[PDB]
Symmetry: D2
Subunit: 130 residues, 4 copies
């Protein structure tokens, strides 16, 4: 069954979108958005409920105060955090990949704590139900 | 700016599962959620065609008995020697393995690395997360 | 300080260069220099005395094009995933790959795992940096 | 081609040495010291010839004491070329393990390691490297 409903997107965005998807080969906006929605579901299902999940927390930030804050938080979740990889990107940007495994609820907690940390510009999760 | 309204047709079953997740994520409504999906979609397509200078990570969770992800990676480490900065591997449990690689380079090549690694059989989940200058992270 | 005098046999070439270096560095004699070498050696291998908990790393160098050394390595690591926390793959050249394995566990088990890894064919070298946890 | 010579070593060290020698598997002192001398020569040569090397710096430390976190950031700035990446692992209440992937000139890699290791809070640590894969010291 198909459900029709309205949606409002900033004009400039809709134009780029319409252009991109016609090129790609989509028949219309709905076909293109159903695909975006299928991937979104696949990327975030892990959040529904509280099962054990594993994955990575990628974050970008720049330099000390935050670097010690990230460490201390890695100490708090000794059980869910396996290890973290730090790569010095450029001059005002550092890359941190944090490997985690545990109850989705604690992972969501660690995440919120990282993203809402002074110095952390962004953060993305690639997480899946183990 | 200017918010434009338009219709969409989506399978009910897909819409239900969608509503439940944006719910849990804390999205205001479907429009706000769909807007983000669209914006990220565009931002990645643009970095692609524009072959922008991106940095990031490629996460792969795969089946130990099925996937030969590591071998695949070691091969690529020679072609894209400049792109692949660091590789981390983790045996999570009896079935799941996690391979995360840090890449830096031109979007087209980096997307090439992702495409390959993600197509390997044995992969359960995986994604390329890249930024250009720390302004976006998709 | 009870000094014990004993003799050892070392190939001339090695000893010649050793004497040259020792002189430069500013050592007075071979005994002094060898004592230092023996001191660092004890520190690096103490963790093997007994069977307490240790943590540290196993660094190996191997040719991934040789047979299925990669699948063998991965299988052995998967088997001991309780002691293997994480691994880093560092590319050297088209054939040579350097991997560093982070581990934690009873010294005895770690020795066992390391012996296996180094025993694999395709693995050229291996080195361990270990220390007991706590103090 | 063997040269035989006499050496003077303090008694307690010799005991701990023989003790380590037995556990490890060496047949005799000569065979063990030969390996120590050879490894020493390989590291020294790489340094004076400031040759190119790849390797790792493993450091186990007390995160409640050491400034490691800081010393690393600082070093990750002056030598952002030789330092490829860093793996951090919180093992237990106290103990922290840091593994730094390095690649560059021996003298600089050596400086980086010496600075990080001579540090406070560091229980144990070592720079493990190879030039072309024929030797791992
Ligand atoms: Cl960006
Ligand atoms: Cl070498
Ligand atoms: Mg949330
Ligand atoms: Mg043995």
């Amino acid at each position: 069954e198909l459900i029709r409903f309205s949606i409002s997107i900033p004009s400039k965005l809709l134009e780029k979108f319409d252009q991109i998807i016609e090129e790609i080969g989509y028949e219309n906006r709905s076909e293109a958005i159903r695909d975006l929605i299928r991937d979104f579901i696949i990327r975030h299902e892990w959040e529904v409920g509280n099962e054990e999940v594993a994955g990575t927390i990628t974050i970008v930030y720049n330099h000390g105060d935050v670097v010690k804050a990230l460490l201390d938080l890695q100490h708090e979740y000794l059980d869910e955090i396996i290890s973290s990889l730090h790569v010095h990107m450029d001059e005002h940007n550092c890359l941190e990949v944090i490997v985690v495994k545990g109850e989705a609820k604690k992972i969501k907690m660690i995440a919120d704590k990282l993203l809402s940390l002074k110095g952390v510009k962004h953060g993305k999760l690639v997480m899946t139900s183990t």
